[PDB]
């Protein structure tokens, strides 16, 4: 539960870091954002779940 | 202080506030790169 | 050839770093008060 919490929360940080640098260069170079519209979508969707994971999971650690 | 668990992120939150300023800065990195059009 | 805009933003942060070290030194050095 605890480590499980620290995993989700810490991963949620690296995903954001990657997501934050991602989305820009994505819409930036029109070399796709059609194949990346897939990547970005998975990043966006995943993120939300993660926040909700850390959300509910917070009340069990702290 | 930050709730016991998040304590490991204390150092992280210590820098978060300054971030907004960076954006105002970044806008200049960009313009420089695009040779001030 | 090294792109100018990179020479600047690197030499730039480099200054914010040294000048920032000075500002830290104001709460630790001899210029402290403690």
């Amino acid at each position: 539960m605890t480590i499980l919490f620290q995993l989700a929360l810490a991963a949620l940080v690296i995903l954001s870091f990657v997501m934050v640098i991602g989305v820009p260069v994505a819409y930036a170079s029109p070399q796709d954002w059609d194949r990346s519209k897939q990547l970005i979508f998975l990043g966006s969707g995943l993120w939300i779940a993660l926040v909700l994971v850390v959300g509910v999971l917070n009340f069990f650690v702290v | 202080k930050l709730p016991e668990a998040y304590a490991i992120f204390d150092p992280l939150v210590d820098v978060l506030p300054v971030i907004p300023v960076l954006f105002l800065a970044l806008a200049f990195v960009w313009q420089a790169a695009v040779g001030f059009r | 050839r090294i792109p100018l805009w990179i020479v600047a933003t690197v030499a730039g942060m480099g200054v914010i770093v040294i000048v920032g070290l000075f500002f830290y030194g104001a709460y630790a050095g001899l210029g402290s008060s403690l």
């Binding site: 170079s29 070399q31 | 820098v15 960076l22 970044l26 790169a33 | -």
Partner: peptide
């Protein structure tokens, strides 16, 4: 102790997201 590790990365992050664009040349 030394969360300067943090700043550093999120600091080089800004210029990076435009640098990668100077490589992939487009939309600046």
């Amino acid at each position: 102790i030394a969360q300067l590790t943090m700043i550093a990365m999120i600091g080089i992050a800004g210029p990076m997201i435009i640098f990668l664009l100077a490589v992939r040349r487009g939309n600046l």
